[PDB]
């Protein structure tokens, strides 16, 4: 019965990302995963 | 609701935002679907 939207507008629109040797991950849980909001942002060279 | 797009009943037709400012992903792409039917039917 979870209804809170997922904070997906926090990683794709980031200003500066982490380095290669210090890659950071974000814990995502207790939300509704709506992946339809990702296609309208920008296409991706690799979507495997 | 029959002819009022104001309330929750929205129009099912939406327009694109094709502009040269938008990069790849939002650009228009022409698609040609060459439907082929190869079977025992007489070929013309």
């Amino acid at each position: 019965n979870i209804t809170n939207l997922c904070p997906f507008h926090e990683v794709f629109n980031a200003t500066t990302f982490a380095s290669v040797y210090a890659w950071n991950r974000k814990r995502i849980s207790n939300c509704v995963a709506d992946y339809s909001v990702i296609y309208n942002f920008a296409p991706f060279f690799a979507f495997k | 609701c029959n002819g009022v797009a104001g309330p929750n009943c929205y129009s099912p037709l939406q327009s694109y935002g094709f502009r040269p400012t938008y990069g790849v992903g939002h650009q228009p792409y022409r698609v040609v679907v060459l439907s082929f039917e190869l079977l025992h039917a007489p070929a013309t």
């Epitope: 629109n13 980031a14 500066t16 990302f17 974000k26 | -």
Partner: antibody, heavy 117, light 109 residues
Framework: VQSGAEVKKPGESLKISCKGS????????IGWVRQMPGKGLEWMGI????????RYSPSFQGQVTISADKSISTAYLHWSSLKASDTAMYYC??????????????WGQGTLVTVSS | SALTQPRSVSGSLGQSVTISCTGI?????????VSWYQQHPGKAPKLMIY???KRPSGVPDRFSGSKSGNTASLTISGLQADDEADYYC?????????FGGGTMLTVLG
């Protein structure tokens, strides 16, 4: 140096400009930030010298468009169906090699558009 | 979120002043997306403090910042007569530019 602000009525599609120097208009982001009398700065959007991947503010998605000129390195703005609350001091800012792409390294002069009838 | 800033401050010549800045958000990639701008009354704004972990070029060393959670502070020393100007903190962690409520620096003497 910037162009003057002529008194216009809401709905005449006025235009503002700003002149910058000291860089190459090739790969440096550039945008416009307004300032209404009595409030702080308000960022609207930016434009890229190449592919114009313009990213407008959520409060400025359909209120103002960027029409900067690349051949003369002079920025321009276009409006349509203006309002009385559009009077603000528009400042032209660029990316600059100081910070990131969204960081504003330099600023323009600023012109206060006056709207009256 | 909206950045909260004091409307008016009261400094002094030779003393220091700390301008508060709350409501700063953060995204994946860092939390130092804090920058300050110096705008003189009726003049053109100039970049003064950005990336408080570093020091900008041309800006005097009497300007510095700090970070403490979601609240930032702008430490300014050596207040003079020409230092009277507007200051605004900016946050660009989510690729969106936001400004504070406006700060007016006043000095006594």
């Amino acid at each position: 140096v910037q162009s003057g602000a002529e008194v216009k009525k809401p709905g005449e599609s006025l235009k503002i400009s700003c002149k910058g120097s000291g860089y190459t208009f090739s790969y440096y982001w550039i945008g416009w930030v307004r300032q209404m009398p009595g409030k702080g700065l308000e960022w609207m959007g930016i434009i890229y010298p190449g592919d114009s991947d313009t990213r407008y503010s959520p409060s400025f998605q359909g209120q103002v468009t960027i029409s900067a000129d690349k051949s003369i390195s002079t920025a321009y703005l276009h409006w349509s169906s203006l309002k009385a609350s559009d009077t603000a001091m528009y400042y032209c800012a660029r990316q600059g090699d100081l910070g990131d792409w969204i960081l504003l390294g330099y600023w323009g002069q600023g012109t206060l558009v006056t709207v009256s009838s | 979120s909206a950045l909260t800033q004091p409307r008016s401050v009261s400094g002094s010549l030779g003393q220091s002043v700390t301008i508060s800045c709350t409501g700063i958000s953060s995204d994946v990639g860092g939390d130092n997306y804090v920058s300050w701008y110096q705008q003189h009354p009726g003049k053109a704004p100039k970049l003064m403090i950005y990336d408080v972990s570093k020091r900008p070029s041309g800006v005097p060393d009497r300007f510095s910042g700090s970070k403490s959670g979601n609240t930032a502070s702008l430490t300014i020393s050596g207040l003079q007569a020409d230092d009277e100007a507007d200051y605004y903190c900016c946050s660009y962690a989510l690729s969106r530019v936001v400004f504070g409520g406006g700060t007016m620096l006043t000095v006594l003497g």
